[PDB]
Every structure is written in C-alpha cells, then in structure tokens.
Amino acid sequence: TKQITLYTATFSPYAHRVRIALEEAGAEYTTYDVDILRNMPDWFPLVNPLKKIPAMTFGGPEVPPDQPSPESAKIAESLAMLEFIADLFPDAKLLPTDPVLRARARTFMALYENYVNGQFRDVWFLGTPADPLLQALEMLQGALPPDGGFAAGEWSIADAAVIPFLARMFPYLEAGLGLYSKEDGVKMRKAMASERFARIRQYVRDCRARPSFANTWAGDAEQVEAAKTVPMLRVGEHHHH
Amino acid sequence: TKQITLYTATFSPYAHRVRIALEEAGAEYTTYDVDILRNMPDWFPLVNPLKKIPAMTFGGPEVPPDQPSPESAKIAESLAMLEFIADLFPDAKLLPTDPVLRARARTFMALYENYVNGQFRDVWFLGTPADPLLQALEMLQGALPPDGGFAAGEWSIADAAVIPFLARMFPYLEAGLGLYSKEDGVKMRKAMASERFARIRQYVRDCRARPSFANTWAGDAEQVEAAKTVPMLRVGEHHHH
Ligand SMILES: N[C@@H](CCC(=O)N[C@@H](CSc1ccc([N+](=O)[O-])cc1[N+](=O)[O-])C(=O)NCC(=O)O)C(=O)O
Ligand SMILES: N[C@@H](CCC(=O)N[C@@H](CSc1ccc([N+](=O)[O-])cc1[N+](=O)[O-])C(=O)NCC(=O)O)C(=O)O
Ligand SMILES: [Ca+2]
C-alpha cells in the first residue's frame, strides 16, 4: 500500500530500468522528472544525497514529490531498486523461484554492469575504441539462452537492467550521437547488423515488444532528442585512435 | 544435497566474498585454488569462460575439482554467488526479510561496486591520487548506521561483499604494497586512523571478529605475501604525482 515515487528523466537508461520493473510489477507509483544535469532542485539531496537519478522514496505520508517527507525510506541505486520491487511484489514473479535460474539473472546483471556498461559509457562519453564494447556485447549475448527467451528464461529484472542501454544503442548510432569516431560508428552499425549479433537483436526486439517497454519509451526519435540535451554528449566532438 | 565447489585464490577479495558467505550459511562446500594469474589450468574455461575467479560449480556428480562435470551449473560473478547462497540457505538469514532493510543491503553493495571499488583499483594498481578514494570511503561510511551494526543492521551478504576489500587496505598500506607513493600511503594511513574514519574502523573490526572472517583469512602477514605474488600490484614499484 505504501507510496512509491520514482525521480526520473526521459534520457536516463538507469531510471528507465526502474520504470520497466514497476510496470512489470503492476505497481501503483508516481514519477517525477528532475533536471539533474542543468538545474538540480535544492530539495533533491533530501531524496538522494548522491544527487543522482533515479531516486526512490517509499512510504511516509502522501506528499508532492518536490516536498519530500523525512519519513519516507530513501532508496538509491537502480539495481537495488530492481531487487526491491521484486521483493515488494512477489506475486508478479519478477525473479524466478528456482535458485539456479535466479542466479542466471543475477549473473547477467553483473556481466552487464561489470563488463558492458563501462564500455558503453567510455565509447559514448569519451570516444574510446569500439572493439572492446563489441567484444563485451558478444560475451553478454553468449549468456542468453540460445533458442530464445530472456536472460533467465522467463522475463526477470535482469532484462529490466539491460534493455534501457541496448535499446538506446541502435537509435543513438543511427543519429550519430556519441564522441566516438566516424570509423567506429560505421564499425558498430555494421557489427550490430551482422549475423554475429543476431541473438542480441532478437533479445532487444523481445524486450521492446513488451508493454513495460512501450509504456516507458518516448519513441526512438524522442529519446534521441532527450539524449541531445545531455551536456557530456557534446555535439561536434569526436575522439580518434 | 547438491555439491558446491568454489574456485578461489588466497589473495583475491572477490573470492573471499564468497567464502565468507558460505561460512555464514553453514554450507558444505569445497574450495580449490587456481593459479589464475600465472598458470591457468587449460580446463578452467569450462567452469568460467571469462577465466576469472571466483568460479562456482553447483550440483552434478561429485568429481575432483580439476575434472569439472558438464552436468554442474556454472555460476560466475561474486555478487551473483552471494545472492545465490542467500537463496539456497533461507534459514541462515543472510539477507533481512524486511524489503526496505533488504534494499539497504543491495544499495550498500551497489555503492561499493559503483563508487569505491574503482577508486581502490585506481589507487592500488595505477597509483592515482588517494583523495578521491578517501572521499568515496567517507561516502560509504555515511551509509552505515552511525550508532553501530552492519550495513543493513544485522549481518548480511552486503558485509561479505565489502569486508574483503576494506580488510586488505590496512595491511597492504602498512606493507607499502600498491602503486601509490609513500606520501599518499602515509596520507591514507593517517586518514584511516583519524576520527574522520572511526565508524568504518568499527565496521572493519566488527566484520573481522566474526568466525566467517577468521576462518577465511590467512592472517595479515600471510595475505600480504599472497598479494605480493600479484603481477599487477608490481611489488617494489610506486608512481609519484
Ligand atoms: N549507479 C547508479 C548510476 C546513476 C547515474 O549515474 N545517474 C545519473 C544519470 S546522468 C549520467 C550518468 C552517467 C554518465 N557517465 O558518463 O557515466 C553520464 C551522465 N550524464 O548525464 O552525462 C546522474 O544522475 N548523474 C548526476 C550526477 O552525478 O551529478 C544507478 O545504478 O542508479
Ligand atoms: N566481477 C567479478 C570480478 C572477478 C575478478 O576480477 N577476478 C580476478 C581477480 S585478479 C584481479 C582482479 C581485478 C584487477 N583489477 O585491475 O582491478 C586485477 C586483478 N589482478 O589479478 O591483477 C581474475 O580472476 N582475473 C583474471 C582474468 O581477468 O583473466 C566478480 O565479482 O567475481
Ligand atoms: Ca552460451
């Protein structure tokens, strides 16, 4: 019954994770957009002392999001939130019940967070070389069940964790967003269209076809525009190696 | 009934996490050391294609650890293993039952993994300045309950995740091991002994006092000697400014 408020922004794949999970859970919840990159509200550190989105409040009296209550629990870090929503809504089966299959979900989230996420971050924001990102994506793709299905078989929070980032890659590449070189943009677009990455393309289509994605996605062109408001995605800067 | 084998190495904090959790769970399990850094066994990629420790096998027929069975589940990534052990041993209460307290545990693991671990890596393996690491440690200390207790109050896998890294810091500093300068080594030793870091010292003492730590620790001097075998810790080498 306790209220959930998620502080969010359209561009953010980290925040997107949690919106997907809340939709899959069937939760009642409130979202509130926060201009974290240009004009952080003075009250925002009350909901997240790290000053990052997503931020979540849970419980406490029902209050406007821009007047957060000291009585609400303040939850930070998107993966903690995913596990939290799975704990709050056990009937939604946001994780398998079998411990080995639950471990496949946790492993997949850790493979993404530890080996892929940092490569997306560095290729897009620093223009580092794309080959180690493609290698990491090939590794992640190898963790998927070969025949189809999601990271742990049935849909789970592991797929909420990963699809925001993978789903952004294709339209960001097409719009030329990111500090990588022309040569690496070509390299990545060809690779992600190649037979080498057929399995992850089907995974992306399968995650995107779910209502939890459709109802938390502004559309490809609108997300690209959101992303162009990010200062670190400086138009006109590219790095070469 | 299903066997647990953990592929480990004394020096490794990541492997140490999983040993602590298996002790806390009261599990029956086998450990098998792997010389991952100098002489990887040609069979090891069958238990973990990433070629990293820790690696875990679960179930299948009882076999010698250097003859892994294709029938065992192969589990990778230390934090996935920690959640797995909690799932396997629910009566050992390795996570809280309360959703919010559980989220404190998951948040604390994410704070360490996202903001602290990379600072330990940079200072110890690259000799980058120590200040950002001290700052990250102060943030992580701020997440602890100020009056006492573990990350989520009661002991949880969150404390298994973090104590292997914190516990190595003091003996490694005392041994001058790591690529940071003597100046930054003194700076860090002084900082970690000051009242600024009293709370995280109490945290390290409280975690270390548990049998799960004693039974998985070689002793400070022995752990330093294991760490000196790590090529990337470059014993005898320090960067300056
Ligand atoms: N580990 C956290 C990560 C959350 C995070 O990074 N949030 C952002 C998204 S924006 C973002 C996030 C990552 C990177 N990046 O370069 O890695 C760049 C940007 N950006 O906006 O330029 C933020 O709010 N930053 C505000 C701040 O730190 O003051 C989680 O999982 O929830
Ligand atoms: N995310 C994984 C991380 C596991 C990991 O990094 N394991 C190591 C420990 S050694 C290690 C781990 C991290 C760093 N580091 O530079 O950060 C340096 C070293 N090292 O031995 O020099 C390993 O086996 N590496 C072998 C390989 O990659 O082929 C987990 O949580 O289990
Ligand atoms: Ca595979």
Author numbering:
A (entry chain B), B (entry chain A): 4 to 244
Copy out sentences from the published article reporting this entry, exactly as the authors wrote them.
In this study, we demonstrated at the biochemical and structural level that T. versicolor GSTs that belong to the Omega class interact with polyphenolic compounds found in wood, and in particular with flavonoids such as dihydrowogonin and naringenin.
In order to get a detailed picture of the ligand binding sites of TvGSTO3S, we determined the structures of several complexes with free GSH, or some glutathionylated derivatives GS-R (glutathionyl-dinitrobenzene GS-DNB and glutathionyl-phenylacetophenone GS-PAP), or some of the HBPs identified by TSA (2,4-, 3,4-, 2,3,4-, 2,4,4′- HBPs). The crystal structures of the different complexes show that this pocket is perfectly suited to accommodate polyaromatic ligands, due to its strong hydrophobic character, while two polar residues are found at the entrance close to the G-site.
